[PDB]
Coordinates of C-alpha atoms and ligand atoms in Angstrom, one line a residue:
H20 CA 0.0 0.0 0.0
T21 CA 1.4 3.5 -1.0
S22 CA 2.0 6.1 1.8
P23 CA 0.8 9.8 1.7
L24 CA 2.4 11.9 -1.0
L25 CA 5.0 14.4 0.2
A26 CA 4.2 18.1 0.4
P27 CA 4.4 20.3 -2.8
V28 CA 7.7 21.7 -4.1
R29 CA 8.2 25.3 -5.3
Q30 CA 12.0 25.5 -5.6
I31 CA 14.6 22.9 -6.5
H32 CA 18.3 23.2 -6.0
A33 CA 19.8 20.4 -8.2
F34 CA 23.3 19.0 -7.7
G35 CA 24.8 16.4 -10.0
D36 CA 26.4 15.4 -13.3
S37 CA 25.6 15.2 -17.0
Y38 CA 22.3 13.4 -16.2
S39 CA 21.0 16.7 -14.7
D40 CA 23.2 19.6 -16.2
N41 CA 21.0 22.2 -17.9
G42 CA 23.8 24.4 -19.3
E43 CA 26.5 24.8 -16.5
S44 CA 29.2 22.7 -18.3
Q45 CA 28.6 24.8 -21.5
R46 CA 28.8 28.1 -19.6
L47 CA 31.9 27.0 -17.6
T48 CA 33.8 25.5 -20.5
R49 CA 33.2 28.7 -22.6
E50 CA 34.6 30.7 -19.6
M51 CA 37.6 28.3 -19.4
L52 CA 38.3 28.5 -23.2
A53 CA 38.1 32.3 -23.0
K54 CA 40.8 32.2 -20.2
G55 CA 43.0 29.8 -22.1
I56 CA 42.8 27.1 -19.4
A57 CA 45.2 24.2 -20.5
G58 CA 43.2 21.2 -22.0
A59 CA 39.8 22.9 -22.0
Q60 CA 37.3 21.7 -24.5
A61 CA 33.8 22.9 -25.4
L62 CA 31.3 20.7 -23.6
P63 CA 29.0 19.0 -24.2
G64 CA 29.7 19.8 -27.9
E65 CA 27.7 20.4 -31.1
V66 CA 25.4 17.3 -31.3
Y67 CA 23.6 18.3 -28.1
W68 CA 20.5 20.3 -27.3
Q69 CA 21.1 23.8 -25.7
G70 CA 24.1 22.7 -23.6
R71 CA 22.3 19.6 -22.2
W72 CA 24.1 16.2 -22.5
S73 CA 21.0 14.9 -24.4
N74 CA 18.6 16.0 -27.2
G75 CA 16.2 17.7 -24.7
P76 CA 15.6 18.6 -21.0
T77 CA 17.1 16.4 -18.3
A78 CA 15.0 14.5 -15.8
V79 CA 15.3 17.2 -13.1
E80 CA 14.0 19.8 -15.5
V81 CA 11.0 17.6 -16.2
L82 CA 10.5 17.0 -12.4
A83 CA 10.5 20.8 -11.8
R84 CA 7.8 21.3 -14.6
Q85 CA 5.7 18.4 -13.2
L86 CA 5.8 19.8 -9.6
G87 CA 5.4 23.5 -10.5
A88 CA 8.8 24.4 -9.1
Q89 CA 11.5 26.8 -10.1
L90 CA 14.9 25.1 -10.7
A91 CA 18.4 26.3 -9.8
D92 CA 20.4 23.6 -11.6
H93 CA 24.0 23.5 -10.2
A94 CA 24.8 20.2 -12.0
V95 CA 27.9 20.0 -14.2
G96 CA 28.6 17.3 -16.8
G97 CA 31.5 15.1 -15.6
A98 CA 30.9 15.9 -11.9
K99 CA 32.1 13.3 -9.5
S100 CA 30.7 12.7 -6.0
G101 CA 33.6 14.5 -4.4
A102 CA 35.3 17.9 -5.3
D103 CA 36.3 17.4 -8.9
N104 CA 35.3 16.3 -12.4
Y105 CA 36.0 13.5 -14.9
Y106 CA 37.6 16.4 -16.8
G107 CA 40.6 16.8 -14.6
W108 CA 41.7 20.0 -16.4
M109 CA 38.7 21.9 -14.8
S110 CA 40.2 21.5 -11.2
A111 CA 42.6 24.5 -11.9
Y112 CA 39.5 26.9 -12.6
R113 CA 36.7 25.4 -10.4
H114 CA 35.8 22.4 -8.2
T115 CA 32.7 21.1 -10.1
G116 CA 32.1 17.8 -8.3
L117 CA 29.1 17.5 -6.0
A118 CA 31.2 18.7 -3.0
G119 CA 32.3 21.8 -5.1
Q120 CA 28.7 22.5 -6.1
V121 CA 27.6 22.3 -2.5
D122 CA 30.4 24.7 -1.4
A123 CA 29.5 27.2 -4.2
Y124 CA 25.8 27.1 -3.3
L125 CA 26.4 27.7 0.4
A126 CA 29.0 30.5 -0.4
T127 CA 26.5 32.4 -2.7
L128 CA 23.6 32.6 -0.3
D129 CA 24.3 36.4 0.0
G130 CA 23.5 36.6 3.8
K131 CA 20.2 34.7 3.3
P132 CA 19.2 31.5 5.0
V133 CA 18.9 28.2 3.0
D134 CA 15.2 27.8 2.0
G135 CA 14.0 25.0 4.3
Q136 CA 11.1 24.4 1.8
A137 CA 13.4 24.0 -1.2
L138 CA 14.0 20.4 -2.5
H139 CA 17.7 19.6 -2.6
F140 CA 18.0 17.1 -5.5
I141 CA 21.2 15.1 -5.7
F142 CA 22.0 12.8 -8.7
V143 CA 25.7 11.8 -9.0
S144 CA 28.2 8.9 -9.1
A145 CA 28.3 7.8 -12.8
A146 CA 31.4 9.9 -13.4
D147 CA 33.2 8.2 -10.5
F148 CA 32.9 4.9 -12.3
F149 CA 33.6 6.3 -15.8
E150 CA 36.8 8.1 -14.5
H151 CA 37.9 4.9 -12.7
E152 CA 37.4 2.7 -15.8
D153 CA 38.7 5.2 -18.5
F154 CA 41.9 6.2 -16.5
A155 CA 42.7 2.9 -14.6
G156 CA 41.9 4.0 -11.0
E157 CA 43.5 1.8 -8.4
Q158 CA 40.6 1.5 -5.8
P159 CA 38.9 -1.9 -6.1
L160 CA 35.3 -1.2 -7.3
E161 CA 34.0 -2.0 -3.8
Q162 CA 36.1 0.8 -2.3
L163 CA 35.2 3.2 -5.2
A164 CA 31.5 2.5 -4.4
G165 CA 32.1 3.1 -0.6
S166 CA 33.8 6.5 -1.4
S167 CA 30.8 7.5 -3.7
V168 CA 28.3 6.6 -0.9
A169 CA 30.4 8.5 1.7
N170 CA 30.7 11.5 -0.5
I171 CA 26.9 11.7 -1.2
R172 CA 26.1 11.2 2.5
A173 CA 28.6 14.0 3.4
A174 CA 26.9 16.3 0.9
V175 CA 23.4 15.7 2.4
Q176 CA 25.0 16.2 5.9
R177 CA 26.7 19.5 4.9
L178 CA 23.5 20.9 3.1
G179 CA 21.4 19.8 6.2
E180 CA 24.0 21.5 8.5
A181 CA 23.4 24.8 6.7
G182 CA 19.6 24.5 6.9
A183 CA 18.4 22.2 4.1
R184 CA 15.5 20.0 5.2
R185 CA 14.1 18.4 2.0
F186 CA 16.1 16.0 -0.3
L187 CA 15.5 13.8 -3.2
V188 CA 18.6 11.5 -3.8
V189 CA 18.8 9.5 -7.0
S190 CA 20.4 6.0 -7.0
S191 CA 23.1 4.9 -9.4
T192 CA 21.6 4.5 -12.9
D193 CA 22.0 1.2 -14.7
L194 CA 25.6 1.8 -15.8
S195 CA 25.7 -1.9 -17.0
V196 CA 23.5 -1.1 -20.1
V197 CA 25.3 2.2 -21.1
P198 CA 26.5 1.7 -24.7
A199 CA 30.1 2.8 -23.8
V200 CA 30.2 0.2 -21.0
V201 CA 28.9 -2.6 -23.3
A202 CA 31.5 -1.5 -25.9
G203 CA 34.3 -1.5 -23.2
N204 CA 33.3 -5.0 -22.2
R205 CA 32.7 -3.7 -18.6
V206 CA 29.1 -4.8 -18.0
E207 CA 30.0 -7.0 -14.9
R208 CA 32.2 -4.2 -13.4
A209 CA 29.3 -1.7 -13.8
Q210 CA 26.9 -4.2 -12.3
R211 CA 29.2 -4.7 -9.2
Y212 CA 29.7 -1.0 -8.7
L213 CA 26.1 0.1 -9.1
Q214 CA 24.8 -2.7 -6.8
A215 CA 27.3 -1.7 -4.1
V216 CA 26.2 2.0 -4.2
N217 CA 22.5 1.2 -4.4
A218 CA 22.6 -1.3 -1.5
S219 CA 24.6 1.0 0.9
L220 CA 23.5 4.6 0.0
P221 CA 19.7 4.3 1.0
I222 CA 20.8 2.7 4.4
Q223 CA 23.2 5.6 5.1
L224 CA 20.5 8.2 4.0
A225 CA 17.8 6.6 6.1
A226 CA 20.0 7.0 9.2
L227 CA 20.9 10.6 8.4
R228 CA 17.2 11.4 7.6
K229 CA 16.2 10.2 11.1
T230 CA 19.1 11.9 13.0
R231 CA 18.5 15.3 11.4
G232 CA 14.7 15.2 10.9
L233 CA 15.0 15.5 7.2
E234 CA 12.4 14.8 4.5
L235 CA 14.5 12.6 2.2
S236 CA 13.2 10.6 -0.8
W237 CA 15.2 7.9 -2.5
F238 CA 14.6 7.4 -6.3
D239 CA 15.5 4.0 -7.5
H240 CA 16.6 4.7 -11.1
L241 CA 17.6 1.1 -11.6
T242 CA 14.1 -0.2 -10.9
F243 CA 12.7 2.6 -13.2
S244 CA 15.0 1.7 -16.1
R245 CA 14.6 -2.1 -15.7
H246 CA 10.8 -1.6 -16.0
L247 CA 11.1 0.6 -19.2
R248 CA 13.6 -1.8 -20.8
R249 CA 11.5 -4.9 -20.0
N250 CA 8.3 -3.2 -21.5
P251 CA 9.7 -0.8 -24.2
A252 CA 6.6 -0.8 -26.5
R253 CA 4.3 0.3 -23.6
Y254 CA 6.5 3.6 -23.6
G255 CA 6.9 3.9 -27.4
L256 CA 10.5 2.8 -27.2
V257 CA 12.0 0.7 -30.0
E258 CA 15.8 0.9 -29.8
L259 CA 17.3 0.2 -26.4
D260 CA 21.0 -0.2 -27.2
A261 CA 22.1 1.8 -30.2
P262 CA 22.8 5.5 -29.6
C263 CA 20.5 7.8 -31.7
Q264 CA 23.5 10.2 -32.1
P265 CA 26.8 8.1 -32.4
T266 CA 30.0 10.0 -31.3
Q267 CA 32.6 7.1 -30.9
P268 CA 34.9 6.7 -32.6
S269 CA 33.4 9.7 -34.6
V270 CA 30.2 11.7 -35.0
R271 CA 27.7 10.2 -37.4
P272 CA 24.2 11.5 -38.4
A273 CA 21.4 11.2 -35.8
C274 CA 18.6 8.7 -36.1
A275 CA 15.2 10.0 -37.5
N276 CA 13.0 8.8 -34.6
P277 CA 14.8 9.9 -31.4
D278 CA 11.7 9.6 -29.2
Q279 CA 11.8 5.8 -29.9
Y280 CA 15.5 5.6 -28.7
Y281 CA 16.7 5.0 -25.1
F282 CA 20.2 6.4 -25.6
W283 CA 21.2 9.7 -27.2
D284 CA 25.0 9.1 -27.3
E285 CA 27.1 6.3 -25.8
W286 CA 26.5 7.5 -22.1
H287 CA 23.3 9.6 -21.9
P288 CA 19.6 8.9 -22.3
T289 CA 17.4 10.7 -24.8
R290 CA 14.9 13.5 -23.9
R291 CA 12.2 10.7 -24.0
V292 CA 13.8 8.7 -21.2
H293 CA 14.6 11.9 -19.2
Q294 CA 10.9 12.8 -19.5
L295 CA 9.8 9.3 -18.2
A296 CA 12.4 9.6 -15.4
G297 CA 11.3 13.1 -14.3
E298 CA 7.7 11.9 -14.3
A299 CA 8.6 8.9 -12.2
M300 CA 10.6 11.2 -9.8
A301 CA 7.6 13.5 -9.4
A302 CA 5.4 10.5 -8.3
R303 CA 6.2 10.9 -4.5
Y304 CA 5.1 14.6 -4.4
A305 CA 1.8 16.4 -4.5
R306 CA 1.5 19.1 -7.2
Ligands
CL194 CL1 28.7 12.9 -16.0

């Protein structure tokens, strides 16, 4: 039996990675390129919609529309759960990981309290895994997952410390079906990492919710995607595995029917999946 819906949301502060970013990586990388920062590249690049790492709005943008909330989206493509980014060259200009986004949000309040009614949305950890696999990190995956969990818990604790009361924390996504992971023959490694994050994180957040009297909702993105991918026709999806917009090894022309695709590029879902995800995330809240 379902429990009562949570109270309405009028403001979201979003923290996270390319699965949330609504233009910050684009703004920041244009700033970095203008300053001549070593190794800077324009992100996300040309085959993306208005600076989103997709062909349309991210899930948190759809969530805000569903709930009738304003969105302040701090997320940065590449953001890790700690201070920095998959793109190590950013560290010289700005700490854009979840911890860096939290620090910047708390430092820009301008002598105003944190809004205790605002929903603090946290969606991060994929870049921890992709960095580890792409650049041979030395942590066993179990230790990498423990650091991801610890980093996310520390972010909720630090936001709560400053006055945040309401949270929505997203689980690991199903990294094991991401086209770049399949092509890297890393499906088992992704399964092991995401299972360790998703078993431990909700246990840590439930303890912190009770200690600090938080409203904290956990969104199981893995259960969500398994249901979509087992019943694709129900949702108008046809192609679950091929990217609509190939980029590896090179950019090729986009598919004609993107709303029937799961993946936009080799890492990121389409606007269609972001829409279904944001609808699903809104399900715990009254409008
Ligand atoms: Cl990312």
